[PDB]
């Protein structure tokens with residue numbers, strides 16, 4: 001499909017910043033039944049389309065009022081980095097909206113009515129942003145539930161190209177306070193796909 005390319009690439013440089021910001025993930029293992037699982041060796045999340053993908057925010061100090069958390073996908077390969085990551089022709093038309101997310105957006109936030117979605121008028125990139133909340137009573141991190149709404153193999157969309165998700169901790173004006181990122185594969189069996197990739201790594 002003919003969509004305009006972006007004329008920039010968002011920052012990807014990991015940055016803990018003044019608040020010691022970084023991501024964490026559940027240690028879910030590779031059983032066939034897992035719906036989401038993260039590989040630290042590959043810094044790569046494996047997940048199923050539309051299922052809950054918990055991503056943890058860890059900070060050493062609490063950021064100021066009005067702090068926000070933004071997620072955005074970009075292609076990992078340099079020759080595709082200026083192409084906007086978006087849903088494929090089938091999924092952008094299939095009317096699986098939750099009533100909040102634009103039908104073209106790959107990344108949604110589940111379970112948060114305060115969510116905001118952006119089509120950037122200058123860069124054309126899609127992103128989803130929520131208010132930063134500190135950890136709830138009894139927890140040491142903040143958990144956000146993301147959903148990825150196309151498969152990596154969706155033709156006319158990601159078309160088997162790898163992507164990364166960039167998470168930005170922002171002030172109320174959008175200025176960057178911290179940044180982290182991870183690769184994502186959206187697939188039918190995350191547990192087996194993760195184990196197949198990891199068991200074939202070099203044992204150093």
Ligand SMILES: [Zn+2]
Pocket residue numbers: 087088089090091149150151154157
């Ligand atoms: Zn799709």
